[PDB]
Amino acid sequence: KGXK
Amino acid sequence: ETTDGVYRVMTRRLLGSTQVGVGVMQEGVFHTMWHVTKGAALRSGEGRLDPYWGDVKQDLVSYCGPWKLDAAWDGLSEVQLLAVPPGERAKNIQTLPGIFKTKDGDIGAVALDYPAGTSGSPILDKCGRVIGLYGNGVVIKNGSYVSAITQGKRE
């Protein structure tokens, strides 16, 4: 994820 | 300004731009994840797109009208993420979803990991219909990511  | 297709969601102030997400234009309505825009208005060329519907718990928002995407994962077949990562052209990734099992039922989920600004990229069935949007998920023990296939209701 770079949760979103 | 509302031509069908997949779009990047960008922000800029005085300097360069950042891709914060992605969304789907279909039937005159723009569909993205709530966390991408926080439900704020969007510019499209010279025009303004105003939020119409949204739901923080589902992490979804639609612009210009009600949510239009109604295709559902069949619970069986492989799907494609049409990933639109920051700074990269759209690419299709095929996968067999896993499952988020919740107290309220099962949700398809894809174990595909992309930058945060990929949020809102559409997930497709074999007919090219959008069965949900990518980017609301969980981090598992090894640090990798699993995203729900998040779909809204077409009233």
Binding site: - | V6, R43, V56, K57, V84, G98, I99, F100, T102
Partner: protein
């Protein structure tokens, strides 16, 4: 903040794509703020 959209492509299924990723079976909870978490 100027938040704006730009077209990035057509929405089309790609034939002859190779399947990848696994198919995890996870127990999760979803809270009222839209956050998923693992049930452990």
């Amino acid at each position: 903040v100027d938040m704006y959209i730009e077209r990035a492509g057509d929405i089309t299924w790609e034939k002859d794509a190779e399947v990848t990723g696994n198919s995890p079976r996870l127990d999760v909870a979803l809270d009222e703020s839209g956050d998923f978490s693992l049930v452990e």
